Amino acid sequence: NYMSNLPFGLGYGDVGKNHITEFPSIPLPINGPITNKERSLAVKYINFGKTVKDGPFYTGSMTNDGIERYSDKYLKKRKIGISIDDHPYNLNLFPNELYNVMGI
Amino acid sequence: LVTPEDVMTISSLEQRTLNPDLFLYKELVKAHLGERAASVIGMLVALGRLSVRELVEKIDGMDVDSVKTTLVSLTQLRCVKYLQETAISGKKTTYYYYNEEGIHILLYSGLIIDEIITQMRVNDEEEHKQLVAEIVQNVISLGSLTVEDYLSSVTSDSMKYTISSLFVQLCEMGYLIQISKLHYTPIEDLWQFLYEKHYKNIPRNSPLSDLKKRSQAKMNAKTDFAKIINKPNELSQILTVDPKTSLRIVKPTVSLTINLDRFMKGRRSKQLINLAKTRVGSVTAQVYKIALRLTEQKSPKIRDPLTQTGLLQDLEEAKSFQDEAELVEEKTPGLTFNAIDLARHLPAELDLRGSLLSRKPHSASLINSHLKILASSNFPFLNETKPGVYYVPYSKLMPVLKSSVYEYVIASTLGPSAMRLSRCIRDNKLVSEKIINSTALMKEKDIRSTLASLIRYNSVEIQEVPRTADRSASRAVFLFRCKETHSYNFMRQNLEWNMANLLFKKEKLKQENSTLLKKANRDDVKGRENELLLPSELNQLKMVNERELNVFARLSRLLSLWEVFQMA
Amino acid sequence: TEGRSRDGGLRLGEMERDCVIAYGASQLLLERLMISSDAFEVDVCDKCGLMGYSGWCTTCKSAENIIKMTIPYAAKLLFQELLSMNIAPRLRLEDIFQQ
Amino acid sequence: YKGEVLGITRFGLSKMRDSVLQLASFEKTTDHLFDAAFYMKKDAVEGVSECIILGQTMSIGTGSFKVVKGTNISEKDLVPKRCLFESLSNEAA
Amino acid sequence: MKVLEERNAFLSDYEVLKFLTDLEKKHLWDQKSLAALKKSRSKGKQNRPYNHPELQGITRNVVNYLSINKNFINEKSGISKMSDESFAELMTKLNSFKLFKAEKLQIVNQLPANMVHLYSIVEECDARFDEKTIEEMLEIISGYA
Amino acid sequence: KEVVVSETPKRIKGLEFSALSAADIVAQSEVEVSTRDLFDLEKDRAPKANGALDPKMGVSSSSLECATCHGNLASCHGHFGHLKLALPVFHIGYFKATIQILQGICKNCSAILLSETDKRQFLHELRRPGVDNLRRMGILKKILDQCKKQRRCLHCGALNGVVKKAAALKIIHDTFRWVGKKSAPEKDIWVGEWKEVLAHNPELERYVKRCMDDLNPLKTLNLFKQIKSADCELLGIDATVPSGRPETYIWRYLPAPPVCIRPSVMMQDSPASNEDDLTVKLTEIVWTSSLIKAGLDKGISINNMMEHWDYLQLTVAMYINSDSVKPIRGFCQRLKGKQGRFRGNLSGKRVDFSGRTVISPDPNLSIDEVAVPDRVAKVLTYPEKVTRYNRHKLQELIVNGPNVHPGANYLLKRNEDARRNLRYGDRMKLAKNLQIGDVVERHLEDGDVVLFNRQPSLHRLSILSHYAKIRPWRTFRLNECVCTPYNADFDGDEMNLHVPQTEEARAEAINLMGVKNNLLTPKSGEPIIAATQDFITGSYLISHKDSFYDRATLTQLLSMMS
Amino acid sequence: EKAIPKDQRATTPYMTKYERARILGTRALQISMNAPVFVDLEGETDPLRIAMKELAEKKIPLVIRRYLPDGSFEDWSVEELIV
Amino acid sequence: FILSKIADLVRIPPDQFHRDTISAITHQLNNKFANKIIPNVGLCITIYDLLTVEEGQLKPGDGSSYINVTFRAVVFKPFLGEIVTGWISKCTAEGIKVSLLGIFDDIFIPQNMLFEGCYYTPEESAWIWPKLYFDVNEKIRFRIEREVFVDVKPKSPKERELEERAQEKPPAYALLGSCQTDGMGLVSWWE
Ligand SMILES: [Mg+2]
Ligand SMILES: [Zn+2]
Ligand SMILES: [Zn+2]
Ligand SMILES: [Zn+2]
């Protein structure tokens, strides 16, 4: 009745429990320490990508009151960001379906 | 018991069901560019070819302008390949791909600037290091960089006189190739536009037949495709001009884009040098760093000369492609070098005197000794064509090198007995349940534990032995097989998935501490963090920052094992 | 139940269903088949088309997108049996009104 | 009407329906069900068989139209009223 | 249930009070709810099968807050006795003064009899104007008081 | 506080069929079935956590607690379990699916058997607004036939052939079907590989036949994860959403159905509780899974594990579809058949408020009436809601109560959740306190709308709506003119009575299915309700030319007629 | 989704049997939910018979919305639909 | 105190078909938005008027009339500088509970932003100023700077069971105020 098909080298107490561990864990050697070079590599990764976030190529956007306050009147702005159309590009490097978003 | 709510919270089983290729690309584009760009790139991964209409239809963003602006941004980032398929009976439209190598810049960025900094001849002075670092960051970030803008932005005449001098060096080396249709068009579409025109201009009643006209059409296509791919892969036509009463300069109106194949060759040679550093002592290993440094600049292809991606290789006489590849490697003398030529680049700090023992000073008879010993070494690093001058082969070096890497990765993940068993299956084709004991002589329980552990992957393929008209593996024995190609498939996807997970976790950490990271990346906060930040929040920020430093180190360390598997 | 001894009900078979459809009596169809045989007030998530419980999606774990609706208990049983074979018959909803 | 003579059989009925539930309720249940799950068919609920199975109202007979109760509310009672502040402030600007 | 827009035409704190006064005078009376007789309508669930809890409470709290004396000083209600014309006659001065801000609503119900109150009502009043037009506006706004 | 709670009336718009990914199977599940035990002696046969009969996936009786919803069998909606499987398995339902998925991709590089421009045009045709199931199946047949025809994978041509199944339940691909009188580097590899074994055994010389590329669950599954996403549309699986991957169709997690799906029947044979087939099967599946889980660490004989791994592929077959040689009842047998799921429960089922007895004639009934026994009128009720128009009547019915026929059996108060049985409780008070929201389940009365049905139902006139007429005897009586639509003949024929329970259904019944509205058959327009035998003969004998009547006889005839 | 103006209506000006049955059922349901009636009951207590009387007097306040297969609809008050 | 335009579906029972339809609709809207606060909009005082009323529809099983309605509802919405004379009713040593006359009283004002001299002591000593203060249950003047709507609310059924066996963010409309400008704090500091 499917409970006598037990091979000889298999103990009888270690069956039935099942319940494989939550995540199989084997410590890889790719979790080593840090050096001057590794610290500098992390710092240069920090500068990069952050640079493009602070640049125009974001395309990820989806206190909003009805009146501009007197405090908002004659006030410093957030930032005059350089827009997607602002920076000059190469026209002959895009399909003709995208040129219209340029301020040619 | 771990709760199903406790699971899926720290276990991360929802991501385990993603295809690893999509996961990594999506996470890179998300953490670097943004969210809408991530959605677009993921949809591109799902559907290889589509139009802007189909993106509008398939993503929540229907705003035709919004998808367009994200697409021009992604195209700049070299993440998109496009084309125009000509509808004849109405309006002809376009289709956009996803360019895999356009995101490897976003993946290799740290290694990219590391190669750009380190590989140069002059690095003692500090200012040049910072200058080239900022220029390479600006180029890899913005994309197609224009000297017309760059010189205009530069403010000092004495400083404009050297940035123009660095562009020629990168163009000639191979880190700056003129950008054109070849980086923004798919290989199969190139070949299918170069493969039917030859079938349109042929006359009729030609005394040949379908097989003959097809073979000559394929020959003509291969010739023109090889020519037009050679033309922009490396040339002087960007800087071949020379202005009057001035210096040699690249053209001021054109754009410059930084390549990645040259950096991939640099990384591969770095892996070879590290292999030598583990295996061969540094006395004669310091030569190999420069021995490959001076040949990589004109080194041949690593996986595909791009004719093996847009079309089928062959069925009968299918040896032709590797035949011609090894034939070209043999014929081209640029890769062959003599003991005299190697002398003018070796630094003095390498003595080249005590690197030999003839029994139990920058001299050619000693550097040629290392040349010959590398050729005669068990791993065919170089092959001997002529007595005195040899060459490094890639016809029979990549398979054995990749198999060594695969074997040692499995051995690092598993035990020495697992390595012994995988090596038995490798060096003995068609092992069986008794040939294992014949060729191993290790205790059966341990060997079969390692066997069961290694079965789960694509390393070892197992054959069902049919004994009666019904096929059953329950009455008869069953022996083993290798089928190594699946094994190479497997190590690509697992590593790609793990890098995807790492990017996913750093994006999670950014999501969890967005306010803190935005505060950190502020002009006044930069450089002044001790007085401003109160001790508790400063401790939280420093701990999360060292965590991300460590995880970037982990990612970079994993960035030395998967690109080598990426080769064919 | 199916037994006259077990106080069973009288089956309304496929041919009687065909007759009622041929009459075009939609509300009578609903009353005889669903309401007066097995009407189950299930909770349906509007994100995943999967029946929950107690207004709890138990896959989104939200209680946000849980709609309350009445379906035949036989239909609920069919969905739970399909999920057993791993088949996911996800229900897509929409407002009855709003024209 | 589909252009080909289609039978009233389990093969002829697989004409244009995509109706996994109607096909199941007719014949060959598990094959159709696993097929629809495998190709991820997104059939609408329009058949009277599916309406009955799901306890929905069929679109036939008394379910083929809508019943609407008029509000009998005019246009002279839907007028916004007693609003001066907006115009007063705008002219104060 | 979707909110078509978040902010519609501003309301001064006199229209709201007259509306709540109208609501109490039209139904859910407080004077008659203070007399016994819950049965009343006898239609099955009280007066004409309806009742108004959770609306009477807030419509009493809002009117109570507006009907307590305007807090210029620690005698009238503050908003009740002014009429539509008592607010209409102020046009020729309300548009006479300049603020370039919808903060008209701040001073039309609260903070009279002090300069500093308006000094918080309009940020940087002194920088914009502190010459002579700092007492006439106070006299106008306290005119009801 | 009290943020606004909003509800919207919604209808089912459609169904998205798909397979649950591994993540979704765990996510929907609320407890993990991992032990082969359901009851233990040490717990006095009380089901506890992690067993097959774990209460956290439901309860089998009203005396228990789910502990997921803490509800009885009456109110628990059922909750899912999941199974962890070591050495995963194939799927019986999607066996041909997995096959056809393999015929499209080369198994070496896991790339599709098409050029990067071969069927992209048919893909562009596949997104046309005009597609049906027929056109979809046709285009999929086209791409399948083409990728089957193709032999060399463009990435790496490895001579794909047939990927048929065994004559067993395993899938085999002929790696070297179309190779003959030709040479290949893979071919020299194959020959040398069989020289390595033909030089080590003295008996495999005959058996080196066959032994093609066999595809097990593990091999196919790990190969499936190699497949990229850009080709899944060609394989026909929308990869936009998770579980659109082609690796989800491989059994890797078994979801354990709620015990409501597989109930445990009380008091069958022995006093000890008995279980059911699906639960027993899943207990076997769990036991085998745990055995293999331990055998990964003890190194079971590789032959026996393959035997067990073939069993796990067999137990699930019965668990899903008992087709293979046999009483085991699988999920494909709960759905299939006359008394299965669809044809037995979903469109056609047992109904409440119905009756059945012998029919007798009644020529004094109107043709649009049926005489209903007072005995069945006292059990068949109509749920009349109290208005300002019928309150006095409903109070009188409540006072009469469940036994006097113009009475009532149940009262559902306006603001309560259950009905008050009127056999007890001093109905005199309940009538006084009767409100305008109350539902009184009062007896079937004269003029009530009933459905009348004689089986088999040939045409639509096999069921008609009649006005109920309460009468003393135990038969349904009908006027003989309406015997023709029912095809009834008073020789022991029985007919079924249905009482619609809603106002809408009642109005629909009496206005569309009413006898007077259905005097004609829709097939020809000819009358079908009309005089039957003795009525025809009596009419003939009256109108016969020899019939004459004096005034007395004539007026008596007219009084009989009225 | 567009309402065809009462000026140009293409569907039948006759109440169909299905529309009559549905109108009676809906109105009887409303009455059973204590909706006010607009006819003299004369001892009638049953919602369906009350609704039949209202239909006979053409006093049922409901509108038939006849959706065309293209999605457009037209509104026919029960009074104007001729029986 | 400003208006807001909302779209809703209102179920009118046949009980209410006798009263005028506008009255019935506004009664149902009042039922739904009497003291209730809209998610991330504000607190609905009551309904002001009605804008769009569609012909009521009937589902085949209810009998009620469901009307798509667009209306304006009066809601309390301070934005950045609105004045309100608080009437507090509780004071903890983490920020006083700026309370109103039963409208909503679940708002706090942060001490770091509050008057610098204004400090709390564990032994209940009111304030120290570098010479005058205020006590509990008096008139307080402050400002408005940021609005936060508590909109996180997941609860498992077992969580609800354990919670009600044992038996926080009480509101979804929390306010806060500043006391940086002279004159804020009392109705009468001088004169
Ligand atoms: Mg008979
Ligand atoms: Zn959900
Ligand atoms: Zn439960
Ligand atoms: Zn291949």
UniProtKB/Swiss-Prot annotation, chain A:
It is found in: Nucleus. It comes from the Eukaryota. The acidic domain is essential for its function. Belongs to the eukaryotic RPC7 RNA polymerase subunit family. Component of the RNA polymerase III (Pol III) complex consisting of 17 subunits. DNA-dependent RNA polymerase catalyzes the transcription of DNA into RNA using the four ribonucleoside triphosphates as substrates. Specific peripheric component of RNA polymerase III which synthesizes small RNAs, such as 5S rRNA and tRNAs. C31 is involved in the formation of the initiation complex. This is DNA-directed RNA polymerase III subunit RPC7. The gene is RPC31. The chain holds residues 14 to 142 of 251 of the full protein.
Swiss-Prot record, chain B:
Gene3D superfamilies: Winged helix-like DNA-binding domain superfamily/Winged helix DNA-binding domain. One of its GO terms (molecular function) is single-stranded DNA binding. GO terms for cellular component: cytoplasm; nucleoplasm; nucleus; RNA polymerase III complex. The keyword Cytoplasm applies. DNA-dependent RNA polymerase catalyzes the transcription of DNA into RNA using the four ribonucleoside triphosphates as substrates. Specific core component of RNA polymerase III which synthesizes small RNAs, such as 5S rRNA and tRNAs. Component of the RNA polymerase III (Pol III) complex consisting of 17 subunits. This is DNA-directed RNA polymerase III subunit RPC3. It comes from Saccharomyces cerevisiae (strain ATCC 204508 / S288c). The lineage of its organism: Eukaryota, Fungi, Dikarya, Ascomycota, Saccharomycotina.
From Swiss-Prot, chain C:
It comes from Saccharomyces cerevisiae (strain ATCC 204508 / S288c). Present with 1950 molecules/cell in log phase SD medium. This is DNA-directed RNA polymerase III subunit RPC2. Component of the RNA polymerase III (Pol III) complex consisting of 17 subunits. The gene is RET1. The chain holds residues 1051 to 1149 of 1149 of the full protein. Zn(2+) binds at residues 45, 48, 57, 60. It is found in: Nucleus. DNA-dependent RNA polymerase catalyzes the transcription of DNA into RNA using the four ribonucleoside triphosphates as substrates. Second largest core component of RNA polymerase III which synthesizes small RNAs, such as 5S rRNA and tRNAs. Proposed to contribute to the polymerase catalytic activity and forms the polymerase active center together with the largest subunit. Pol III is composed of mobile elements and RPC2 is part of the core element with the central large cleft and probably a clamp element that moves to open and close the cleft. A zinc finger (C4-type) spans 45-60. Belongs to the RNA polymerase beta chain family.
From Swiss-Prot, chain E:
One of its GO terms (molecular function) is nucleotide binding. It comes from the Eukaryota. InterPro entries: HRDC-like_sf, Rpb4/RPC9, Rpb4/RPC9_sf, RPC9. Belongs to the eukaryotic RPC9 RNA polymerase subunit family. This is DNA-directed RNA polymerase III subunit RPC9. Component of the RNA polymerase III (Pol III) complex consisting of 17 subunits. Forms a Pol III subcomplex with RPC25/RPC8. Interacts with BURF1/TDS4. Its main location: nucleus. The lineage of its organism: Eukaryota, Fungi, Dikarya, Ascomycota, Saccharomycotina. Present with 2930 molecules/cell in log phase SD medium. It comes from Saccharomyces cerevisiae (strain ATCC 204508 / S288c) (Baker's yeast). Keywords: DNA-directed RNA polymerase, Nucleus, Phosphoprotein, Transcription. Coiled coil: none annotated. DNA-dependent RNA polymerase catalyzes the transcription of DNA into RNA using the four ribonucleoside triphosphates as substrates. Specific peripheric component of RNA polymerase III which synthesizes small RNAs, such as 5S rRNA and tRNAs. The RPC25/RPC8-RPC17/RPC9 subcomplex may bind Pol III transcripts emerging from the adjacent exit pore during elongation. The keyword Phosphoprotein applies. GO terms for biological process: termination of RNA polymerase III transcription; transcription by RNA polymerase III; transcription initiation at RNA polymerase III promoter; tRNA transcription by RNA polymerase III. It holds the Pfam family RNA_pol_Rpb4. It is found in: Nucleus. GO terms for cellular component: cytosol; nucleoplasm; nucleus; RNA polymerase III complex. The keyword Repeat does not apply.
